[PDB]
Amino acid sequence: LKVRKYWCFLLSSIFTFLAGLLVVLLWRAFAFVCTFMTEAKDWAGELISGQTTTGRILVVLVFILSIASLIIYFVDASSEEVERCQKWSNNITQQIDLAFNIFFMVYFFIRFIAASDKLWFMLEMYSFVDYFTIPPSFVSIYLDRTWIGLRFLRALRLMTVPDILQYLNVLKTSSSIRLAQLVSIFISVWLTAAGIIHLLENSGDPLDFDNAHRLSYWTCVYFLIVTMSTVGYGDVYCETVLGRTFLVFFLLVGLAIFASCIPEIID
Amino acid sequence: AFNIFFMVYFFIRFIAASDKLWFMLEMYSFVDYFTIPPSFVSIYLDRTWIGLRFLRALRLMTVPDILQYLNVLKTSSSIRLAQLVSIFISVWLTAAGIIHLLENSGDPLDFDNAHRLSYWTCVYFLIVTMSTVGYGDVYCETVLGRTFLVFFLLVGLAIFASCIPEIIDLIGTRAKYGGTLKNEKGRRHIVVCGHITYESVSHFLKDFLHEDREDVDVEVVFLHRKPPDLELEGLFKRHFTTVEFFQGTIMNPIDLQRVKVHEADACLVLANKYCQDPDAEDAANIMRVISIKNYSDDIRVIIQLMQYHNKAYLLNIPSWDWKQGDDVICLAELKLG
Numbered sequence: 001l002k003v004r005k006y007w008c009f010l011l012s013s014i015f016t017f018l019a020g021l022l023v024v025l026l027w028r029a030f031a032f033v034c035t036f037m038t039e040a041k042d043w044a045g046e047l048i049s050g051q052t053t054t055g056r057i058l059v060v061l062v063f064i065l066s067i068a069s070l071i072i073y074f075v076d077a078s079s080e081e082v083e084r085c086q087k088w089s090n091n092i093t094q095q096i097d098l099a100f101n102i103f104f105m106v107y108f109f110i111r112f113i114a115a116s117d118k119l120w121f122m123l124e125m126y127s128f129v130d131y132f133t134i135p136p137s138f139v140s141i142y143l144d145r146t147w148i149g150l151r152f153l154r155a156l157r158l159m160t161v162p163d164i165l166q167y168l169n170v171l172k173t174s175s176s177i178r179l180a181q182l183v184s185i186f187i188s189v190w191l192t193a194a195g196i197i198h199l200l201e202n203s204g205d206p207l208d209f210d211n212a213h214r215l216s217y218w219t220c221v222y223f224l225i226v227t228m229s230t231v232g233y234g235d236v237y238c239e240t241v242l243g244r245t246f247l248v249f250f251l252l253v254g255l256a257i258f259a260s261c262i263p264e265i266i267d
Numbered sequence: 268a269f270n271i272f273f274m275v276y277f278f279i280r281f282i283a284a285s286d287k288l289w290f291m292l293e294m295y296s297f298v299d300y301f302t303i304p305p306s307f308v309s310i311y312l313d314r315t316w317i318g319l320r321f322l323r324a325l326r327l328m329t330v331p332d333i334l335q336y337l338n339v340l341k342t343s344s345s346i347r348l349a350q351l352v353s354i355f356i357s358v359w360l361t362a363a364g365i366i367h368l369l370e371n372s373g374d375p376l377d378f379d380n381a382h383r384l385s386y387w388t389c390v391y392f393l394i395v396t397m398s399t400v401g402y403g404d405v406y407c408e409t410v411l412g413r414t415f416l417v418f419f420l421l422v423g424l425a426i427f428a429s430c431i432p433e434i435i436d437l438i439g440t441r442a443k444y445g446g447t448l449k450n451e452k453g454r455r456h457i458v459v460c461g462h463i464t465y466e467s468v469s470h471f472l473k474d475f476l477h478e479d480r481e482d483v484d485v486e487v488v489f490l491h492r493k494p495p496d497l498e499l500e501g502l503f504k505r506h507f508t509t510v511e512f513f514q515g516t517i518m519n520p521i522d523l524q525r526v527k528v529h530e531a532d533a534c535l536v537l538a539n540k541y542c543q544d545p546d547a548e549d550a551a552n553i554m555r556v557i558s559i560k561n562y563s564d565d566i567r568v569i570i571q572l573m574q575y576h577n578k579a580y581l582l583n584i585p586s587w588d589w590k591q592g593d594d595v596i597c598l599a600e601l602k603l604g
């Protein structure tokens with residue numbers, strides 16, 4: 001605890017994104033000097049879209065585990081400290097987190113096979129969630145320490161709920177589909193923004209981390225809703241430079257996007 | 268070194284100005300008045316003051332003019348977006364400089380109530396003020412700072428209310444449907460155009476993909492001008508591995524290349540049976556066949572036809588050959604038959 005090992009978690013996530021990106025380019029370069037893909041890509045297409053009987057099982061199961069994974073983060077965020085040292089067997093939360101991540105890793109591989117374009121699949125917004133969530137876990141299980149990191153990014157998976165419902169033919173009316181999309185976007189952004197504020201405020205300013213503003217995750221949720229509604233009580237506010245820096249950008253695009261969202265939700 | 272260039276540039280604009288009196292009162296001219304003459308005071312007075320040098324941020328609103336001079340911006344939306352972005356950023360930075368100067372210097376004639384406040388904290392302060400959030404952690408204490416804040420609240424809030432909503436709107440949503448169909452070895456695909464709605468697509472897909480039919484792998488490509496509604500997008504999602512959609516018109520040769528009509532097995536032109544004017548619907552669909560045949564004559568075309576007397580126009584097309592597979596489905600002829 002004398003020296004923070006947060007860069008080790010960040011370095012692996014950056015390396016995984018960089019290594020995965022160049023391999024696709026390297027494979028294209030390797031394809032210049034150089035079936036299963038005909039069957040697997042078509043087969044994986046129905047698996048992710050829930051067209052086959054086994055495809056719907058995967059679609060429903062990943063829907064449930066996405067909800068359960070976010071709950072695991074909620075109890076994790078309840079910890080007062082940002083970095084903890086503990087063995088894998090000591091805590092059962094880490095074991096269950098590992099159980100959910102291996103499923104999210106094989107599911108990531110399945111979509112990669114079903115992806116028609118490999119370069120854009122790596123650069124899609126969904127893959128960045130996996131890059132900053134899965135590789136951190138193996139680093140934690142290897143170095144034998146845990147860190148809050150960027151674990152709040154699984155809240156971004158809540159915006160695929162309308163896609164899952166449409167795959168199972170649950171939503172049919174256009175109004176119902178539009179309402180579900182807007183609700184998922186508002187909730188996912190609200191929870192993700194709270195996680196960013198919670199991490200930045202608690203960790204403190206980089207490279208010295210002497211100004212740590214103790215702030216509970218649920219208090220951050222109450223802080224964001226006040227900020228979004230332009231109420232600004234001032235009882236809870238950001239003090240760190242990075243906390244204020246992110247708030248400046250959130251006030252620009254977060255309110256602008258939500259300007260046309262709530263009016264078309266109430267009607 | 269920068270100011271002597273900004274001084275000769277001021278002289279160049281003075282020569283090019285048709286009217287001299289109105290050139291002296293220009294907003295960009297006042298920026299030169301409070302920037303360069305103070306600079307030559309420092310070289311002589313041997314002391315530096317923050318002063319009003321923050322006015323160089325007002326030069327950011329000349330950025331759209333510079334881009335238009337170089338013919339970089341041509342579209343109206345691109346020009347409008349640059350103008351709104353430059354106006355908002357320059358006002359935001361200039362207002363922060365005014366707050367930073369007034370708060371740090373203190374009230375005139377005593378200068379004993381100075382409030383130590385960083386420039387970047389002022390930048391964070393104005394954006395909170397313009398968003399009408401008002402945390403209250405950072406606020407103005409001097410008389411001048413509050414006086415300028417009162418003036419800013421009247422005009423600065425209007426700038427935020429007009430620029431920010433349009434900036435995101437001008438950027439807009441990405442074109443979800445577009446690009447070129449991916450080429451696959453041994454792939455048999457067809458192109459369906461014409462009346463593409465949730466009514467036509469759902470009935471067509473149920474018939475085309477039926478368990479009682481022969482098991483053949485044929486991808487279906489839909490081309491339409493309007494973006495599909497949420498009902499149609501969900502239908503395409505359930506048929507992701509076999510049904511594909513593109514945005515574009517069949518009469519555009521560029522759009523024909525995107526869907527690869529020349530490699531398509533056949534082209535299907537649906538028709539709007541419940542149309543107000545069958546003559547208009549028939550002839551619009553006839554023009555679609557001409558565009559497809561113009562791109563390549565050796566393409567099988569199947570079209571739905573409302574009235575029979577419009578079949579003569581298609582039969583008179585030099586590239587129309589019934590022996591090669593071209594067929595006309597006449598609704599009136601079959602229904603009355």
Ligand SMILES: CC(C)CCC[C@@H](C)[C@H]1CC[C@H]2[C@@H]3CC=C4C[C@@H](O)CC[C@]4(C)[C@H]3CC[C@]12C
Nearest residue numbers: 006010014017149150199200203204205206242
């Ligand atoms: C795909 C890449 C290029 C996007 C940019 C990389 C981003 C995700 C990386 C690079 C620098 C990283 C930051 C470096 C420093 C800090 C401060 C620490 O207290 C919390 C984590 C945080 C805030 C990191 C978050 C993730 C981060 C912003």
Ligand SMILES: CC(C)CCC[C@@H](C)[C@H]1CC[C@H]2[C@@H]3CC=C4C[C@@H](O)CC[C@]4(C)[C@H]3CC[C@]12C
Nearest residue numbers: 297301318319368369372373374375376378411
């Ligand atoms: C073209 C002319 C008539 C316009 C009005 C002249 C303006 C620009 C001049 C005249 C008086 C000047 C002010 C005199 C006193 C102060 C207080 C000092 O602490 C900050 C500068 C400030 C605020 C000056 C700003 C510039 C100023 C307001």
Ligand SMILES: [K+]
Nearest residue numbers: 229230398399
């Ligand atoms: K308001």
Ligand SMILES: [K+]
Nearest residue numbers: 231232400401
């Ligand atoms: K307020």
